[PDB]
Structure formats: structure tokens, C-alpha cells
Design a protein around this ligand. Sequence first.
Ligand SMILES: [Mg+2]
Ligand SMILES: [Zn+2]
Ligand SMILES: [Zn+2]
Lengths: 1336, 476
Amino acid sequence: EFDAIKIALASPDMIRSWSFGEVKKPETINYRTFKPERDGLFCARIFGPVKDYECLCGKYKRLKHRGVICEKCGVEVTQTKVRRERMGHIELASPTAHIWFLKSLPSRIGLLLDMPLRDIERVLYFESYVVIEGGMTNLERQQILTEEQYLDALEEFGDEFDAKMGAEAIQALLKSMDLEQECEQLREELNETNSETKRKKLTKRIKLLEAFVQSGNKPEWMILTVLPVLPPDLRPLVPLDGGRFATSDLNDLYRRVINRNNRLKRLLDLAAPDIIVRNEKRMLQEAVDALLDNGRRGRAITGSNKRPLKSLADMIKGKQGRFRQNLLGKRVDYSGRSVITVGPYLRLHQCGLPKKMALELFKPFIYGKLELRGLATTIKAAKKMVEREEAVVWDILDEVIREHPVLLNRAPTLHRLGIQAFEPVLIEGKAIQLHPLVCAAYNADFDGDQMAVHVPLTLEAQLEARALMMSTNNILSPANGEPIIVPSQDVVLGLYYMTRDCVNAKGEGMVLTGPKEAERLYRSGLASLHARVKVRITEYEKDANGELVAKTSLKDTTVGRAILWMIVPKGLPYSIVNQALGKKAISKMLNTCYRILGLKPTVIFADQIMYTGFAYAARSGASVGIDDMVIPEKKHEIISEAEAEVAEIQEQFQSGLVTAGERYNKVIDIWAAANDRVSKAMMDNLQTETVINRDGQEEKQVSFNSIYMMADSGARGSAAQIRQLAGMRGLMAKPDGSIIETPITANFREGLNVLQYFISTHGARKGLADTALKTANSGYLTRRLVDVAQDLVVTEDDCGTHEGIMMTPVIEGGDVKEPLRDRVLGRVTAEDVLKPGTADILVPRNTLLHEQWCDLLEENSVDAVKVRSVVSCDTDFGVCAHCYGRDLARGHIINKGEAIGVIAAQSIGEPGTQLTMSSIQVKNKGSIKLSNVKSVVNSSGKLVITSRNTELKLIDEFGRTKESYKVPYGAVLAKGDGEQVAGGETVANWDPHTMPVITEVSGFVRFTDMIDGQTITRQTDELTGLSSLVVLDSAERTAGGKDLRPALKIVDAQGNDVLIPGTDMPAQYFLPGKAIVQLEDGVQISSGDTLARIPQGGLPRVADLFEARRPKEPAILAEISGIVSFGKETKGKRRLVITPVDGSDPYEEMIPKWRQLNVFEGERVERGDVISDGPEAPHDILRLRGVHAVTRYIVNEVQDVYRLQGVKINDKHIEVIVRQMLRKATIVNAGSSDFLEGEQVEYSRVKIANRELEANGKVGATYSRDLLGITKASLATESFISAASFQETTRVLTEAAVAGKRDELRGLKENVIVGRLIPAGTGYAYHQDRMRRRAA
Amino acid sequence: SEIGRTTDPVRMYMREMGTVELLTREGEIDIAKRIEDGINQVQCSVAEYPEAITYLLEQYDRVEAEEARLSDLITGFVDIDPELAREKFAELRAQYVVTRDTIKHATAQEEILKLSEVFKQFRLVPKQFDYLVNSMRVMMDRVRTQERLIMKLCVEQCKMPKKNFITLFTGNETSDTWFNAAIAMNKPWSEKLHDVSEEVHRALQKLQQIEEETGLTIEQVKDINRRMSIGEAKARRAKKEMVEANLRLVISIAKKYTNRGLQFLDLIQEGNIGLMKAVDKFEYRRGYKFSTYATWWIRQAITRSIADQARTIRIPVHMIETINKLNRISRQMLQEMGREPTPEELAERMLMPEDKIRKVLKIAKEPISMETPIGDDEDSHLGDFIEDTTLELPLDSATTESLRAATHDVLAGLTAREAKVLRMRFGIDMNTDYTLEEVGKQFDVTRERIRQIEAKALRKLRHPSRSEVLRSFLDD
RNA sequence: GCAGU
Ligand SMILES: [Mg+2]
Ligand SMILES: [Zn+2]
Ligand SMILES: [Zn+2]
């Protein structure tokens, strides 16, 4: 039908070609008879007939004569629907500037004319003249003039030159200009300009001019001489039933425009003075500019409610514009909604649908089945039968819903499991019955939640509901590969109570012939569910060939685990139920069953688990009383001891020994110690209070307390709440965050008094307000991520690349936070993984690392696997199915057509509402190993690191690292490199509060330009015994030694200048200001000791990481690898220079010296080493260290936020967003290509252009990748429909219009806007057919 | 200065407007006398064109027959009484007598400015003078189109700066005797003008025809045209000073109409139109101050503008006056009896029928905006509760297609002749229905026979054999 | 606007 959407500027000829007549009069309709008035805003002659096939005089009334232009009134005889399609126009008496191309910055009229917007707004508001042609005169072409200056120019030059004002002048300037000549002239004066700011202005102006000359646009079309009129059925004037009318604001704005325009034509005919016609032209300009964009220039026009009128631009932009409110989401037929209730009798694929909802949702299905089966002779008869609700329409309704799925949806749909399909079971209620196991997927509790039901009509929609979205296909999560159809509070508590053991329980010690006899004993009341017993268990294991081999053994079990074994499918072991099953043990049971046996046994197992958990929780009688919350009898004495302790700290404050700051801190710590004591005493009382008798001897076991059974199951609650029920609830914070020094010494079993309760409300309402105000932030982050990543589809099977990230375990300091297993599970390897014993490949090159392969990776001790990632995929316009890896929801390699960007964006932004708003001591045994090493030995026997970024890992006896610390520069290391340690001992120590400069090699003092009094101030003090010296500040020096930097260097007592071993450049120590030296001239210090000392999260953090924003004071990274030196000083910025000897040396930086610099002038640096310290900026990481480096940085810094809240998200989903962020490139060398230096091109475009150039021998362009934020990358797509739909519709539409852009509907949003199949999923085959048959 | 500091067009208007100083009582007199001198000298300039004299005198004899009234012929005479006009137009007739033949061309050049300064004492009305000046603009268009024919009939043929050809043209006015020295340059322009030297023929004489039907030479009537332009621009210059000085009066009046439906600037622009009307309709000989006249005209213009273009569904000015009288009367009644008056007492304080008051009260409402939020709820509006009533229910679309199918089958159960008679007589399967005569010409059968055929098929289909499915298409 | 999730 159509394959692209071209946007451009509208010529006045184009505006007159759309229109079906000119609107000459502001008349909307006639007031007596509501027929629309001639030549008006609603004109039946212009805009078409107001009734179907009927002219407005009624002379022609039937479609016998259609398409007939009546002669009594000029109304065509055709459908009235043409009033939604037929535009009109207004001939403006004065040219009027378009407000979008004048005011949306940067001004296109301003950028095109090389004219400031203040000058243009003064010319077109009739406040100044402008010389549209100079001639043989000193007046140039952009020279504005005042009124009297224009009079003086007319005195001196007469009627030779041409000068005008208003938008006629701007239109003459846009019309008279030559575009190709000025473009080539700007290219000339850009080749000869080296000022980077002028080069930026020139290149943006050149791209504007060349975008005009490549498209069909002319500049003067930005000045409206004809104005279009929207069809009157889109700005309707409709009579409300109460006699009153209801109009759109567009009729008021159009009527204002036509009134001012007809008055301007009047004044131009009357030959009015220039003051009046200038004021009228200004009013017409502001009325047209209020029609197009109200409020963009100055004060918004407000009509008759003192509320601003909604202009044309407001119809299409914003959260209430067409793009977001009617085109990306829309109200939908065949849709109902009701409250959800449990229905625990259901199977995983069933919902309960009310009969009175399903009779309305499926009305045409019932009409057609009543017509078909002969039960109704007509559709009117069938309608009456459904309306009366006969007994036969219920049989028909049972027929029409039989295998017909419905989609159930709980808004907010945070992720794709917020819409799942179900087969309806007709129930008689009015509430939907939602299966329990899917509630966690919807985040749905039955406390009033409502859910919408949608009916898939077509066979394709029914088959997607059944194949793609049905809740039996959805038992794994797409964020992490873990089960999401998972048992929960009542189920977990039932299975925990059944699978526990009691010591002397009824029926202990007998021997059973199997699980069926155990169930017989329990139901007969001959044995309790916890009696430790001996059951003959037959279990099957999948053999290596793939079938199930049996084994029969007497298992020491309890009666309840024997009973639960009856529902476990065959290929699972007995160790899977022979334990007290908490929430995680049940989730592991389900995950094991899914990996071992598959989906079809797992859904049966999940339903059976739910039924048996509900059943044996019902039989449990598990109840919360008030005696379940046992307060420890040590609470009162622990609290009295803490009160006595704070009283002694209070008398120590009254006696002045401690300041109120340390007093406050010590009172807080001796209240938190008491809180931890009370919590430990409470839990020690609560977990094991069951002491019971085995053959007379008392014996303690795990408590059967209900509060503890719920907490220990993981059914509901944690010890953080049990501590507030039965312990104390401790220190509460003020509204600002400073914790109050006296705690709530009460719990909820006892009362909180009035003051304790008020103090607790302080933090309660803060939590509630953050919850109510961060959903509007996490939803906005999710929206930005979706609109950056939507178009990423898996489009290939393999790109054949060999790149990939080196996955390693996440070791934050001393402990691991994510192993290699959950980091490489599901990836494909990028290179052959080989054993630590080399030359035998452990895992082959291109292998998908499923759970067996990961078990192989942890049998051996491989700790770094190079895997393939989407940031390194060679596929252009998409991602190969190998560089993604596994589809986490299914568990196999991902299919071609999966829309992985929307999955990644939902998986990241779904947990958003769970977010908020010195010496090293090796912990366990291992062999230390330091990297980035430059090392010497000290005078005493330490190991001294003369290197900045040396990092100390603990290589264990297997090769894998278990802790990773950062040892600073100059820190003395007690051990060597490769020496075993003891668990808990210290390896490295240093000075935390000051930075030492350490001796390179043993030698003698030379004070080179260390001038006393000019660069050195001598200080004296008694308790040191030896006088000290300070090298002077910048603001304390006299003229002198700041220009010649004072240096301390190495010599011998020989008089020979002993220097670094290996080089002969002069060794120095250039001591900066704010330093300390307590050493005199000629002192002897050996290598390895100091010579001088120098003193020194949440949801917004994720949002800032993805917007790629530069931090406040970023770390200054070394650009290129060279040696450090210094230039000019004291202009506020010391001048660093980094010189590589092996090339073009000078690279100079302008570091402001109020930053504490982190490198000395002697050592060599590399790209990325921090010259100064601070939070790294990701642009610098991408620029200097590479793409994989900023990828690793962003995924680590995002998972750091997500792992504090205990949120598992696979790294694929952050790597997708990172790939979509670094999607542009800048040309540094244009090469033999059609790009310009310094322009931002799509990276895939320049990559394939370089490929097709290198194919023909010509060398391609070279580029530098860019890191844009998710907003700046969403708005910079090559598709203007997606960008205009996202946000900033006005800027995107003006850029796209003046660029003459084209949008090929390639992503997902442009195909949702126009109502097509999306190019992902079941619409991917359709688009492959469409682009392989519309290409040849 | 303040140029470029504001965006409000009201402030720019007041800025550009305050830079004109007001007038004293005697300043308006001076400006009005400048206007009057410009207009009566331009009326003397069209009096230099004696076809206007012929028109004046023939409508003067029609005044002797009273074709139209004298007030819109003449406003009086300066140094209505009709006996001045008759005999002193006879005096102008005797003046036309003494100028018609006293040319025997150096002695005729005094009687023409004597005509002008004896025409001095004449006053003329706007509309018949508008007829005269449209005739004069026809004269102007003819003069300029003939001189531009002379301009670009030769220069589309030649390349030469045409001042050499204008130097010989001015004064000849009768023939091509000025073309005898055109070729003497012998630079190729007058060579190419060879090929034009003929086709100017019926041009160059025909203007010279009417030249002496109006009596005066083409060059000196071009002088009359430029003197007319000078005098008229002199009048229009002084009409500009009087408008630009009284622009504060328009604002002082229009500030009283501010929130009555129009913007402030719309009111002051319509009042400016009214002020220009007052200026070109003002005469100072009545001795009244100009502001008292311009106030009437500005009030008229502003209230007429509010009556015409302040409403979405425009109501006429008579219904606007009716609604204003109604609101005033109900205002006074509420003030005297402390409650809103019923239409059956509002109709008796006025003297209109009660149903007229009811329809007037039904009329006076302004349309709601569809962006009005409901209950201060911003995400909703009035616009998304309004349904499209003109649509057809898809159950009714299915009913229509099912009725088409059922009718098609139960007419397929007939003879093709009579079934086509029914499909042809109604509009079934056809764009139009046909009356019996049409199909009588078509079926080669007389009218009442095929009428009986239609009745035959209708009686046939009324049976409960076939009409059991069709009856369910009838309502209950 | 006011509530519900
Ligand atoms: Mg809820
Ligand atoms: Zn008609
Ligand atoms: Zn790839």
C-alpha cells in the first residue's frame, strides 16, 4: 500500500492543492437553522455535505445522482465522511512567519539567514528595517536599520536600495538568497577557519543549507502566505443535548485568524495609515502564531474560561497529544474489566470469567453461532435471544469459549508477564478468578485489584494467545531465567509444614512400603505428618542415553515428605523433597524440574505443588495468636543496661570529657548494640523454644511457632519484622534522616506510646511518599529505555564475529557478589575455553553455555570466559541470535525475530519501584598476586609499590580469585608476590590521610631550586625534636619559585648523579605545594621509604548512568601514553603535557590546580590511567579505553544499584541498552566517502559504507564512537516518527521538515503508529517477504 | 531604546502611538482645512477635465427633472437651499459658454484657471464625485497604458536607453512625425524599430481622438493627472495626521468594551476603522469639536464589531440588541425584586411574547470548549465523552447485509421477469429506482400491466412460504 | 478535583 512517510515543507501551491476552497468568512453555522454557513469555517460547499448523499438545499437527496455538484447550493452529493478528509485554506493578506521555523531553537530562519533571532523578531514585529538589497551603497544585506536610520539612508541614497520590515522583508531575504553559492562559500571559509566555535557554527549552517538543496524545499516556504484549514469534522462544532453547543478551540483560533485577515484586507483597501496596518499585520502574525503553537511566543491566548486555547501543535504533542494518547495506545473494543479473586481450583492455563462478562465480550460469536445452528433465523432474532438470555445462549456460550483464550492484564503492565492468556472457565460471579501461581507475575493481590480482559478475535490472535502468551508458556522470567510461576505464602507454608520433622511425633520409627502407605497412615490418623520414618522410595534418574532408570532404597524420611513425593515427577531425585521446603527450596524444585524434564511436566508439577500446599496448610491450622510473639525475658534487663550506659555517657558529657558529637555517636552505638542484643535474644528464644522429650530425655528442635514458621518458610515476613513484633523496633530517623538518639524500646506486641508512635510515623510517611513519588520516575525511566531500544530485533543467526566481553566473577573487595556461573550461563563463548592445564579445549569456541557446560566450568576452576555480547555484534540493524545468547524465558538460544530491546527495557525498568528515592586484611587462605606492578624493597624488608594502579588479587590454589583489593601508590607490602597468608591477617598498609612520595632508588639529597625563603619556609616545633620545612603555596610565594618549580633529586656521595637503572634522564621529585618535609640537606634515605607527605545510589543513579551524564568533577584520564611534564601556571589551571617520545609528542591539558593531581612528573602513563581521581565519566571510558570498557563500566555500575535491593537481572539487558546508546559515530577523517569531518553519522551507515568502499579498493572513513544518553539517542534516530512520538515533537518535526526527511517504518513504533504488523515476532516473516518482494 | 524588549503587540502599539502629539482646538481646524483644500483642489483638478463639466450639467438638467435629491448632489456653497444651485449652475453654464469657443490657443489659457477659481465656490458630495473619479481613473488607466505601450512596444524590439526616444515624443501627440529622426542615430535600435513603425497605428491616433472630445492635450492632461495626484496625496497626508493624533481617543473608548468577547487590540483596530470613517466624514464648519464626532463613530464601529465577530455561532445585530435589552431589563428587575425574573414576567416588563423571550434566552449561550476538564480532572475533557452519533452500529451493518442476502434469495425464488421488475422498480442492485413509465419504455409493455406484475410478485411474496425469514427483519 | 489498584 505504502512503504515510507516523507515529511517536507508545504509550498503555497501544495497548500492550495490540498484545499477544496477558500474560507473567506469566519461564520461557523447559522444560529436559527444549524445548517453551516456559506464560505465559512464549516462550509458544506467547501468541506463537503453535512448529510450522506444530500446537498444543503435538499434539491438532490439520493445516491441515484451521486458526485453531483448541485447548482442551487454548490454542495457535492457524496458521503458526509469527506468532511474528515477535505481541507480548506485561508489566503493571508500579509506573509506570516511560521512560528515553528522561527522560534523552535535553533531558529531555522535565523540559522539560514545568519541572523540572530532578536534581529529577526525585531524585523518581523515592525520594530526595525532590513536592507534586502544593497546595490551601489555601503548598506549590506543583513544590515538592520531603525526608522530614523532608514529615513537617513533614504536621504543619502534614495530609491536605489531596497529595505523593508515585517515578514515581507524576511520572505524577501529568504527568497533572494542563493543556497549553493553560499554553501560553497561557507565551505571555503570553513576550510580556512581554525576557530573551533566558528567551525561548529559553520558546519551546522552548511548542513542546513545542504539539507535545503538536497530536498525539494525552498527557504521562503517557511513564511506562510497561504494557511491550511483543518477539516471541520476534526475540529467539530457539535450540539450537546441540552441545547448548548460544544466546539474545539481550533474554531476559535481559526475565527480569530480570519477576522484579523479580513480586517487587514479592509485596511489595505481603505489606504489606512502605516501605524494601523502595521498593528494589524502584527496582530495577524500573532493570531496565526497562536493558531499554530499557542504560548510559544509570549502570552498564551485564553478564551472564555481563562484557560489557554489548545492550538494545532498541542493536538499532536505531549502526554495528551495524538501520538501518545491515540496512536500508541488506544481504547479497544471487546474488552471488559473486573475485580480478581483467587479461584485456587484452577489449572495454570485457566481463568475464571464471569458469565455476564463473557456473554458481552463474545457477543458476535454468539450471534453467529445462533444464526449457524438454526436457533435464530436472523441476527435481530439472535440479538433478542442474547438480550433475553435464554437457556440456549448459555449452551452456545459454553461452545464459543471452549478453546478460545482471553488475555488478562493488570495495569501497570510493568513487564510482558503483565499480560497473559488463559482459557476462560465460566463462573457465576462478577469477579475474575485469577490462578494463584500467576499473581506474583502480575504483582496482584486480592485486595481490590481489577484486571482487564481482552478477546483475541482472529485465528492468528488466538494462536498467539495460545502459543506465545498462554500462562503455561510463561513459567520462566525474561529478566532472569528463574521461575516466575512460583509458589507463595500459603503454598510455601503448607509445603514447609508438611516437610518438617518433629522429634517424638506420633508414629515415629515405623517402616513403610512407600508413599501411599504414608498417606494411608496420615489420613487414618495413625501417624503424624512429621514422624521420622523409613519409607521405601523408588526414584528415577535420566541416564546418559536419555531414559529413566529406577532405583529402590529405604530412605530415612518423614511421613510428610513421603506424601509429597507422590506428586514429584519421575526424573527428579529424592533429595529434592527430603528437607524442610522453604520458598527457595520450592523454587529450586521447580527450576530443577524445568531443566531436567521440561515444560509439560513442570506445569503439572506446579499445579500439584499448589494443590498439596494449599491442602496441607488448611490441615495445618497455622494461626497467629498473641502468644506466638514471644518477647525475650532478657529484653527488660538489656534495655535497663543500655539506659544505664547512656546515663554514664550523659554524665561524661556533663563533665565535659566528650563533645556532644561523640556523645551522640556513642549513645547511638550503645543503643544499636542493645538492639542487636535484643534481636539475637528474641530469635534465639523464638527459633528453638521447642524442647520436647525423646524417650524421656529433653531435646531441642526447631520451633513450630507460627510466626517463626511463616518467617523461616519465606512465606511472609523476615526477621526484620519479627524483630518489631517481639523484639524492640529500635532507632527511628527524623524526617531529614538523622536518627533520633533514643529508640523505640517497645514492640508491637506491647504498645507504642504516643511519642514512640509519632516518632515512627516520621519514617512511615517518608516511605509512603517516596513510594507514591518514585513510581512516576521509574515509569519515565522505563519509557525512555523502551523508546531507545524498541527497534532492536534479533534479525540474524550469526554475524561470525570473534569479539566478546571477558566475563569474570564480580568480586567487590573481599567477597564475591556474582559467580562466573550466573554471569556466563546462557551466553555463547567467543573463544575456545581451555583448562588451566593448557592445550586441551575445555569448551569449544561457539558453544552455548547451558547448565551442563557451566557445571563443567565449575568442575575445573576456569574463572574468565570470553563470551559474545550484543555490544560487539557485527550485525547492522539488529542483533544476531548468537551474540544475544539464550532467550531467558524459554531456556534455548533465542529465535530470529525476538524484540529483545523491548524485553531489555522492560526487564530493567520493572524493578524500578524496588529502588530508592586504612589497611587491607585478607579474609581467607590464598596466594597473593599483584598486577600493574612497579616494585622495590624497602630498608626494612617490606615490599614497596612504586606504581599507581597496582591491584592485589588473591589467587587461590585452583587459580580462581576470591578477593581483589586496591593497594595505593607507595603502600608498604608485608609479603612478597606469591606468598601464602593467614585468614584475617594484614598484607598491605599505608597512610590514609596523606599521599607519600617514595624513594625510587637509594641515593643522596640535591635541593635543585629548592630555595629557602623563596620556595621553602622553615618551621619549628618542640615535640618533633627536628625542624621541618614546607614547599610554598601558590598564594604564599613571593615572585620567584612558582615559575621555576623546586625539585628534590638524587645524587651520590661520589658527586656522581646516580639515576634510574635503564635510563639516563634526570631523576626528580617535583614536590607540589601543600607538602611536608622534615628532612635536611644531604640526608641518606634508601629505596622504599617516604620522602615527603601531601595532605588531601538508587533510581536516580540508574537514570544518570543511562543518560550518560558527565559527573560533577570527573576523573581526568590520561589521553595518550607518554611522560608527564608541566607548562604555564597560575591562570587558574596548571598546564600538564603528556609526551610520547615515539611520535608526535605534545598533548597539553589545562587541569585546574584546585584538583589534587594524582601523578608525578617522572613516570610514564597509558591511556585511561587517572591523572586525577574522581567519578569517571563514561564518555572518557568509551573514548580512551574502548567500547567493551564503557560496556563493563555501565553494566557494573547498574548492577551495583540493582544488587543492593536484591534484584536479579541478566546482563544481556543492560548490554542491549548500552549498544543502543553507542549507536552514533563522528567522522574524524572523511576518507574516500561522502561524509564530512565532525558530523555525527549513524554507526551502521558508516560501517557498511566503509565495507563497500574497501570492497572497491578505496579506503573508507575512520570514526570515533559516541555515547549518547537514552533520551539523546532516542531523539537522534533516523526515523522521525519514533522521535516525534517519543518527546519534543516540535523540534523533531521542524528538523525533519526542513531536512526533507523520510521514514521507512523500520522499527516497531512506526509500524504501531500506522497500524501494521510489527517487524518483530510473528510479523517478522511478513516483513521479510515484504522487503524481499518490494526490493526485486 | 525600548526596541526589541517586548513581545506584546499591545505594548508595541502604545509605543508607536504615544510618539504622536495630540491636537489643540485650533490644530484640528488647521488639519481639517488642509484636508478640505486638498479635496476641493483635486475636485478642481477633475474640473479641469470638462467631460466632468458635461456630466455635472446633464445631471443638473436631470435635477431640473429631479432624478435624485439635491443633498446628495450638493452640500451647499461656500463664499439645503436649492435655489442657489439652479441659477448658479446656470452661471457655470454661461462660464462653459464663454470657454467653449473663446480659443481663437494663447488666449484660451486664462479662461481655464478662471474656470477653476470660479469652480472654487463649489461643494461636491462623496458618491457622485466617486463616479467622477472612477471616470477619471479610467482616464488615468488609458493614459498610462498608452504611454506604457509607447514604452514597451519599442524596447521589447530594441536594446537602447529610451530617453533618446522620449526626447522626441513629448509634444507631437498627433502622428509619427517624431519618427523621422529616430533612424538618424543609425545604431541598430531604430533599425529594429523599423519592424514596429507600423503596428502602433490604431493606437497613436485613438487617444488623440478623445483628447479633443475632452478638449485638452494628452500631455497637459497628464499634467492634470499628476496635479490631481499631488492634490490627493496632499489631502490624504492631512487625513493621516488627524487619525494618528486621535488614536488615544480610540483606546480610551475601547477600554470600556474589553471583556465583551473581543481582544483589546481587535477593539482598538475596529475603533481605528471607525475613526478613519469619522475623519473622512468630518466637516469643521459646524464648529463642533472633532472628539465628540469621532466618539459616536468609534462607539458605532466597536459595538458593531462585537455584534458581528465576537461569537462562534454568530447571531444578527438585531438579536444582539434584543439580548442586550433583555439582560438590562432582567438586571433592573433583579435589582428591584431581589430574584431572577421569570420569563413570564420578563416578557411583561418588555412587550414581547413569552415564547420570543424563551427563544432569545435559548439563543444567548456560547459553545463550551471540548477541552473543558470535567470536575477539574485534567486527563479527561469534554471532548472524549462526546460520541459520534452519525455512525452505524455494526449489528445494523450485519442486519443490512443479511437483509440483502435474504431479499436476494427470496427474489431468486421468482420468475426472472417479475424479479427484475421488482429489482428495477425499487432500487435493488441498481443506483436508481424507476417509476412505471420508465420501465414501460424499457420492458416494451404498457404501464399498468407491469404495475399488475409488481402487485403479482408482492402478493406472491406475502405468502408464509418464503416470507418467514423476511418477517424477522421486521421489528417487534 | 476525590478515591481505588
Ligand atoms: Mg492490590
Ligand atoms: Zn443542492
Ligand atoms: Zn553478533
